[PDB]
């Protein structure tokens, strides 16, 4: 039993970017609820730029604000700040940050009629993923382990805030 | 370039996502 991927990953990315672009104008599609499907990819992509955000506040602006204190640069510095920490900590949040950073900037550039930049960003992303993050992706089996990473959100006993039952007094 | 800055978004994102 060897299931093959019908659509290319770039098509999914385009669907995600396109969806986000449509979501801010006219919601087109449906509401996936009760009905387990064999497509965790689209769900994972959605969660990649919706999970942490819904438990954050407005990462799309906050993350760019809290890190806007130090003199940065253009897009060449945005996606580069994600890879910066990737070099010394390929944690799940780094993979998510790398994807959301590119997706957000690309979606914005698409609306700004800057496909030229989008193509460059995507080109660099693919190159990086098949060069420096090649072994990492090979270890994670692509998005294999990622599917189990976004399974929950409140379940964490590493550094999660100790409140209520745990630490009531402080 | 700026690992300190990268670490900021990293740690903040990691903690916030998994319920800060």
Curated annotation (Swiss-Prot), chain A:
PROSITE patterns, per database record: BCL2_FAMILY, BH1, BH2, BH4_1, BH4_2
Pfam families, alphabetized: Bcl-2, BH4
Membrane-crossing residue ranges in chain numbering: none
Subcellular location: Mitochondrion membrane
Membrane topology of this protein: Peripheral membrane protein
Organism domain of life: Eukaryota
Motif (BH2): 135-150
One GO CC annotation: cytosol
Residue numbers carrying N-acetylalanine: 1
Positions occupied by motif BH4: 8-28
BP GO annotations: extrinsic apoptotic signaling pathway in absence of ligand; intrinsic apoptotic signaling pathway in response to DNA damage; negative regulation of apoptotic process; positive regulation of apoptotic process; regulation of apoptotic process; release of cytochrome c from mitochondria; Sertoli cell proliferation; spermatogenesis
Gene Ontology molecular function: any one: channel activity
Key words of the record: Acetylation, Apoptosis, Membrane, Methylation, Mitochondrion, Phosphoprotein
Tissue expression pattern: Expressed (at protein level) in a wide range of tissues with highest levels in brain, spinal cord, testis, pancreas, heart, spleen and mammary glands. Moderate levels found in thymus, ovary and small intestine. Not detected in salivary gland, muscle or liver. Also expressed in cell lines of myeloid, fibroblast and epithelial origin. Not detected in most lymphoid cell lines.
InterPro entries, A to Z: Apop_reg_BclW (IPR013280), Bcl-2-like_sf (IPR036834), Bcl-2_BH1-3 (IPR046371), Bcl-2_fam (IPR026298), Bcl2-like (IPR002475), Bcl2_BH1_motif_CS (IPR020717), Bcl2_BH2_motif_CS (IPR020726), Bcl2_BH4 (IPR003093)
Family: Belongs to the Bcl-2 family.
Functional note: Promotes cell survival. Blocks dexamethasone-induced apoptosis. Mediates survival of postmitotic Sertoli cells by suppressing death-promoting activity of BAX.
Domain notes for this protein: The BH4 motif seems to be involved in the anti-apoptotic function. The BH1 and BH2 motifs form a hydrophobic groove which acts as a docking site for the BH3 domain of some pro-apoptotic proteins. The C-terminal residues of BCL2L2 fold into the BH3-binding cleft and modulate pro-survival activity by regulating ligand access. When BH3 domain-containing proteins bind, they displace the C-terminus, allowing its insertion into the membrane and neutralizing the pro-survival activity of BCL2L2.
Subunit structure: Interacts with HIF3A (via C-terminus domain). Interacts with BOP.
Protein name: Bcl-2-like protein 2
Organism: Homo sapiens
Gene name of the record: BCL2L2
Curated annotation (Swiss-Prot), chain B:
Protein localization: Mitochondrion membrane
Motif (BH3): 5-19
UniProt-annotated site: Cleavage, residues: 18-19
Signal peptide (UniProt feature, chain positions): none
This protein's name: BH3-interacting domain death agonist p13
Annotated organism of origin: Homo sapiens
Whole sequence portion shown: 82 to 101 of 195
């Amino acid at each position: 039993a060897t299931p093959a991927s019908a659509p290319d990953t770039r098509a999914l990315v385009a669907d995600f970017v396109g969806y986000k672009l449509r979501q801010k104008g006219y919601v087109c599609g449906a509401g996936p609820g009760e009905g387990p499907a064999a497509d965790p990819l689209h769900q994972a992509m959605r969660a990649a730029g919706d999970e942490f955000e819904t438990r954050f506040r407005r990462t799309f602006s906050d993350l760019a604000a809290q890190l806007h204190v130090t003199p940065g640069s253009a897009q060449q510095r945005f996606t580069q700040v994600s890879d910066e920490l990737f070099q010394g900590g390929p944690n799940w949040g780094r993979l998510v940050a790398f994807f959301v950073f590119g997706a957000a900037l690309c979606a914005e550039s698409v609306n700004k009629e800057m496909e030229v930049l989008v193509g460059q960003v995507q080109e660099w992303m693919v190159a990086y993923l098949e060069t420096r993050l090649a072994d990492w992706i090979h270890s994670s089996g692509g998005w294999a382990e990622f599917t189990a990473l976004y399974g929950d959100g409140a379940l964490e006993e590493a550094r999660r805030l100790r409140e209520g039952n745990w630490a009531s007094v402080r | 370039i700026i690992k300190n800055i990268a670490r900021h978004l990293a740690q903040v994102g990691d903690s916030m996502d998994r319920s800060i």
